[PDB]
Design a protein around this nucleic acid. Structure first.
Ligand SMILES: Nc1ncnc2c1ncn2[C@@H]1O[C@H](COP(=O)(O)O)[C@@H](O)[C@H]1O
Ligand SMILES: [Zn+2]
Length: 180
DNA sequence: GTTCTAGAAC
DNA sequence: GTTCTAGAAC
């Protein structure tokens, strides 16, 4: 198929769709994740095209920090009274093109969460904290990731709240209800 | 990334 | 027999 129509290019379409946008400024847009992996799951994307964290440099440091600040503001404005826990961060190896910050509530209560890769992408070192990426760019001038990231996706399923081992996705999803 | 579904795991 | 995972997608 075409390059523009390839599944990996999907964010470039969604980020311009008014029905998916929840916030816009001169630098970034925030959209609802199309397949949210928790009750609240947004993506913050810069208007300017940066393919992934591999292409990030110190010229982008202000922008990365702004993405983070905007993520925090969205949490306050859309979920403030919920007092839920959120994490903000980046997948170590993303699937979709165009740099995007995940802003995600820690209930992980969603039918879109369906497999081990989903779980481990948000709940192991595969999930790079936004603050960590920012500090890495500031100090080293670029984002590097260690070997072994794909193997992390195959780790046994463990609750992020109490660290209990669960044998399957359905059993994990049922266990997570206990932490509401 | 998702959709579908064969066949493994239970 | 049903649940569950994991790989092909031309
Ligand atoms: N067409 C789309 N529009 C909006 N979000 C998407 C689309 N396709 C995938 N996603 C989400 O974008 C994220 C991409 O994850 P990653 O590239 O692994 O950081 C996931 O949370 C997906 O649910
Ligand atoms: Zn637990």
């Amino acid at each position: 198929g075409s390059h523009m129509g390839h599944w990996s290019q999907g964010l470039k379409i969604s980020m311009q769709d008014p029905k998916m946008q929840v916030y816009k400024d001169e630098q970034v847009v925030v959209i609802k994740d199309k397949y949210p992996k928790a009750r609240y799951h947004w993506l913050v994307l810069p208007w300017t095209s940066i393919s992934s964290l591999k292409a990030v440099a110190r010229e982008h440091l202000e922008l990365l920090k702004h993405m983070h600040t905007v993520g925090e503001k969205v949490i306050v404005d859309f979920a403030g009274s919920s007092k839920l826990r959120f994490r903000l961060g980046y997948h170590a190896i993303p699937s979709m093109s165009h740099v995007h910050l995940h802003v995600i509530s820690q209930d992980f209560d969603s039918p879109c969460l369906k497999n081990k890769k989903h779980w481990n992408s948000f709940n192991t070192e595969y999930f790079l904290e936004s603050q960590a990426v920012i500090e890495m760019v500031q100090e080293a001038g670029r984002v590097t990731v260690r070997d072994g990231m794909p193997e992390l996706l195959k780790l046994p399923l463990r609750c992020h709240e109490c660290q209990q081992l669960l044998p399957s996705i359905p059993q994990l999803k049922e266990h997570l209800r206990k932490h509401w």
